[PDB]
Design a protein around this ligand. Structure first.
Ligand SMILES: *[C@@H]1O[C@H](CO)[C@@H](O[C@@H]2O[C@H](CO)[C@@H](O[C@@H]3O[C@H](CO[C@H]4O[C@H](CO)[C@@H](O)[C@H](O[C@H]5O[C@H](CO)[C@@H](O)[C@H](O)[C@@H]5O)[C@@H]4O)[C@@H](O)[C@H](O[C@H]4O[C@H](CO)[C@@H](O)[C@H](O)[C@@H]4O[C@H]4O[C@H](CO)[C@@H](O)[C@H](O)[C@@H]4O[C@H]4O[C@H](CO)[C@@H](O)[C@H](O)[C@@H]4O)[C@@H]3O)[C@H](O)[C@H]2NC(C)=O)[C@H](O)[C@H]1NC(C)=O
Ligand SMILES: *[C@@H]1O[C@H](CO)[C@@H](O[C@@H]2O[C@H](CO)[C@@H](O[C@@H]3O[C@H](CO[C@H]4O[C@H](CO)[C@@H](O)[C@H](O)[C@@H]4O)[C@@H](O)[C@H](O[C@H]4O[C@H](CO)[C@@H](O)[C@H](O)[C@@H]4O)[C@@H]3O)[C@H](O)[C@H]2NC(C)=O)[C@H](O)[C@H]1NC(C)=O
Ligand SMILES: *[C@@H]1O[C@H](CO)[C@@H](O[C@@H]2O[C@H](CO)[C@@H](O[C@@H]3O[C@H](CO)[C@@H](O)[C@H](O[C@H]4O[C@H](CO)[C@@H](O)[C@H](O)[C@@H]4O)[C@@H]3O)[C@H](O)[C@H]2NC(C)=O)[C@H](O)[C@H]1NC(C)=O
Ligand SMILES: *[C@@H]1O[C@H](CO)[C@@H](O[C@@H]2O[C@H](CO)[C@@H](O[C@@H]3O[C@H](CO[C@H]4O[C@H](CO)[C@@H](O)[C@H](O)[C@@H]4O)[C@@H](O)[C@H](O)[C@@H]3O)[C@H](O)[C@H]2NC(C)=O)[C@H](O)[C@H]1NC(C)=O
Ligand SMILES: *[C@@H]1O[C@H](CO)[C@@H](O[C@@H]2O[C@H](CO)[C@@H](O[C@@H]3O[C@H](CO)[C@@H](O)[C@H](O)[C@@H]3O)[C@H](O)[C@H]2NC(C)=O)[C@H](O)[C@H]1NC(C)=O
Ligand SMILES: *[C@@H]1O[C@H](CO)[C@@H](O[C@@H]2O[C@H](CO)[C@@H](O)[C@H](O)[C@H]2NC(C)=O)[C@H](O)[C@H]1NC(C)=O
Ligand SMILES: *[C@@H]1O[C@H](CO)[C@@H](O[C@@H]2O[C@H](CO)[C@@H](O)[C@H](O)[C@H]2NC(C)=O)[C@H](O)[C@H]1NC(C)=O
Ligand SMILES: *[C@@H]1O[C@H](CO)[C@@H](O)[C@H](O)[C@H]1NC(C)=O
Lengths: 132, 128, 43, 53, 53, 53
């Protein structure tokens, strides 16, 4: 009576789905990530841990190309030695949980490449608006 | 629960003074006012007074002043703060005062007034 | 060994003290320094 | 034949307040923002290893 | 809400939140004894005898 | 600097109440002596020469 698509649209409802189908609903996981005599200190430090981690994530977005786009095209090529898989096999085969273990080893290279790309883009835009 | 337990029915003489107790239990007794109301045959209800048990500030019916008196007794222990006793010394007894007396408490809702008397004692019949 | 000119840095003080039981008490002694005790005022 | 309580030689004792009770009231443990609680809906599950549901 | 096609290994023995609940109920058991009466004045000589029986 | 106390103290637990222990001084075992500190004469006169300089 509730329907399968209704609990599909819940929190973490697409964790077993394909990542192409899981891409349709990312705002749900992004929304239940911020809001939700001695014990007030414990709940208070839990709340500030939540907002501080959300700010760390929004800053790591903000130092890249996108501030609030939630889907971010960018300009570093995928080094195919990182995963060596076809496109249509990963967007229709695996989940996100299965993909993260495949790319957990090759990470913090990608983040530095994104920061280098954004620094290069900002200085190129500075030069372009400088000569104009 | 909210319980109001009065005393038994009593027979008095004209010119005497009756004391009627009203033990209240099941709520914080210092918060809610206690009203007293009477029921006379062929006369209906009539209000007597109220008492606020926090300090004991009372207010009497205008046509019963000089005769009625209301006191209370609070519970001073950190184990049973719930119970309390109200009293009513009704004096200057006449044969017309043969009636059934009730001690009442209002409700606990937000839109409850003071006079929507929710909880009622079982009544005490006074025959003069 | 005691000399009148010299002053000892320790005193041997006995006193009543309460116990686990509120009815009973005990005579017990300790050693204190000169600087922790003062004289209240033979004995 | 004179007695004393057993705990006198080790610890001063505290009476429970008769106003407060000891009966169980059910706690629901809740995850804060940024976490989640998973529940094994499986039937035959010894608490170690994979839970399929 | 149900979650499909998923295999999370569980472990009740190295589980957390049973450690912190065992901490929390002890600490809260202590926090419900601070307003109560200490039996310091009751450690005293008792003169006991058999009950009438 | 080498500082010492040549006395050999024995402590003595004195119960005050339930769960209350007062740690007194029992007997002195050995010679009653006076505590002191030692520095070297040469290094101290050298460092005083440095601080005058
Ligand atoms: C730890 O806690 C302990 C528990 O309390 C504590 O021990 C008690 O300490 C007090 C004071 O130090 C003791 O009181 C003294 O007791 C002496 C012992 O006498 C007892 O034993 C005798 C048997 O040997 C009994 O016969 C005797 O009873 C007789 O005497 C009573 C005296 O009032 C009388 O009421 C009875 O009816 C009976 O007739 C008693 O039970 C006792 O001797 C002493 O009195 C004088 O004697 C000493 C010489 O022996 C003097 O040095 C001492 O100073 C007392 O002099 C008094 O009298 C002089 C002459 O009149 C005065 O000039 C003095 O000022 C002084 O007067 C004071 O005392 C009077 C009572 O005596 C009083 O009436 C005055 O107003 C004035 O205040 C004294 O009574 C007690 O016995 C101890 N109890 C125990 C169980 O040991 C201990 O001190 C604490 N500390 C330590 C480190 O342990
Ligand atoms: C644990 O142990 C304690 C020990 O102290 C018990 O406490 C005593 O218990 C006894 C017996 O249960 C009590 O004695 C009874 O007291 C009654 C009330 O006392 C009044 O009357 C007497 C006159 O007898 C006055 O002296 C007193 O001041 C009071 O004004 C009496 O009515 C009883 O008398 C009846 O029994 C005797 C038996 O010999 C008959 O001869 C009499 O005719 C009469 O029928 C009796 O004397 C005593 O009072 C208790 N003391 C206290 C301080 O309470 C506990 O009861 C016990 N508990 C348990 C569970 O075992
Ligand atoms: C665990 O459960 C998930 C949830 O069901 C399950 O994922 C599903 O897999 C099937 C295939 O195995 C998916 O079906 C395909 O999905 C792709 C996604 O783009 C579609 O393009 C496909 O459409 C083609 O087929 C149609 C007819 O079948 C044609 O008409 C059409 O033109 C296309 O050619 C097809 O629908 C299904 O979408 C997913 N569902 C989700 C939510 O991901 C997964 O396989 C299960 N895994 C295990 C191990 O059990
Ligand atoms: C605080 O005081 C309490 C009350 O005294 C103490 O509780 C009891 O302490 C005794 C020790 O003194 C424990 O053991 C008892 O000991 C006597 C004598 O011991 C001899 O016999 C036993 C028999 O096995 C033997 O093992 C010994 O080596 C001795 O040879 C026995 O007669 C008793 O039956 C009993 O064994 C008590 O068990 C203990 N009571 C309880 C309820 O446990 C307490 O220890 C004190 N605590 C502190 C910190 O001081
Ligand atoms: C994409 O994958 C290729 C895999 O062939 C990467 O090429 C290799 O990159 C590593 C470092 O990432 C090079 O190692 C280097 O070796 C020199 C030798 O002196 C050393 O000094 C460096 O510190 C470093 O360890 C390796 O040589 C290189 N392979 C070849 C054949 O040159 C490539 O870097 C990947 N691209 C990105 C953007 O990560
Ligand atoms: C016991 O100690 C007392 C004091 O605690 C001594 O009395 C005096 O002690 C000081 C120095 O401690 C001396 O200067 C005084 O001369 C002492 N008084 C007298 C009258 O000599 C006392 O000497 C010590 N010894 C004895 C045996 O009582
Ligand atoms: C302070 O004490 C230390 C001991 O811990 C002394 O150091 C030793 O002194 C002896 C002389 O008797 C030497 O033989 C050792 O080689 C020293 N050991 C070390 C590790 O230095 C030190 O001399 C004392 N200081 C003074 C000023 O007396
Ligand atoms: C990731 O790299 C480590 C070596 O740094 C290797 O041990 C591990 O197997 C790699 N993971 C995958 C999934 O290949």
């Amino acid at each position: 009576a509730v329907g399968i698509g209704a609990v599909f649209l819940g929190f973490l409802g697409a964790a077993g789905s394909t990542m192409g189908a899981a891409s349709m609903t990312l705002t749900v996981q992004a929304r239940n990530l911020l809001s939700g005599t001695v014990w007030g200190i414990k709940q208070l430090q839990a709340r500030v841990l939540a907002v501080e981690r959300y700010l760390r994530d929004q800053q790591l977005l903000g130092i890249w190309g996108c501030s609030g786009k939630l889907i971010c095209c960018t300009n570093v090529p995928w080094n195919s030695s990182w995963s060596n898989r076809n496109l249509s096999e990963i967007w229709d085969n695996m989940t996100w949980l299965q993909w993260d273990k495949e790319i957990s080893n090759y990470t913090q290279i990608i983040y530095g490449l994104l920061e280098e790309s954004q620094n290069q883009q900002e200085k190129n835009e500075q030069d372009l608006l400088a000569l104009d | 629960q909210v319980q109001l337990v009065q005393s038994g029915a009593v027979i008095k003489t004209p010119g005497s003074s009756v004391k009627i107790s009203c033990r209240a239990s099941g709520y914080n007794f210092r918060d809610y006012s206690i009203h007293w109301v009477r029921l006379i045959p062929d006369k209906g209800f009539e209000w007597i007074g109220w008492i606020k048990p926090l300090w004991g500030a009372v207010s009497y019916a205008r046509q019963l002043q000089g005769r009625v008196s209301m006191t209370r007794q609070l519970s001073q222990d950190p184990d049973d703060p719930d119970w309390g006793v109200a009293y009513m010394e009704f004096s200057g007894l006449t044969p017309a005062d043969t009636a059934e007396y009730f001690c009442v408490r209002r409700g606990s809702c937000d839109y409850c007034g003071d006079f929507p008397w929710q909880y009622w004692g079982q009544g005490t019949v006074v025959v003069v | 060994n005691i000399t009148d000119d010299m002053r000892g840095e320790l005193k041997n003080c006995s006193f009543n003290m309460t116990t686990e039981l509120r009815d009973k008490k005990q005579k017990v002694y300790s050693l204190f320094y000169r600087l922790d005790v003062v004289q209240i005022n033979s004995n | 034949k004179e007695y004393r309580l057993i705990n006198c030689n080790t610890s001063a004792c505290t009476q429970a307040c008769p106003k407060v009770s000891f009966e169980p009231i059910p706690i629901h443990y809740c995850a804060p923002a940024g976490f989640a609680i998973l529940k094994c809906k499986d039937k035959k599950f010894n608490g170690t290893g994979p839970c399929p549901s | 809400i149900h979650l499909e096609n998923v295999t999370e290994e569980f472990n009740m023995w190295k589980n957390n939140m049973v450690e912190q609940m065992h901490t929390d109920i002890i600490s809260l058991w202590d926090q419900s004894l601070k307003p109560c009466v200490k039996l310091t004045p009751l450690c005293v000589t008792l003169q006991c005898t058999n009950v009438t029986n | 600097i080498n500082c010492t106390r040549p006395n050999n103290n024995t402590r003595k637990s004195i119960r005050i109440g339930p769960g209350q222990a007062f740690y007194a001084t029992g007997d002195i075992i050995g010679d009653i002596r006076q505590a002191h500190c030692n520095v070297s004469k040469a290094t101290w006169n050298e460092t005083l020469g440095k601080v005058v300089k």
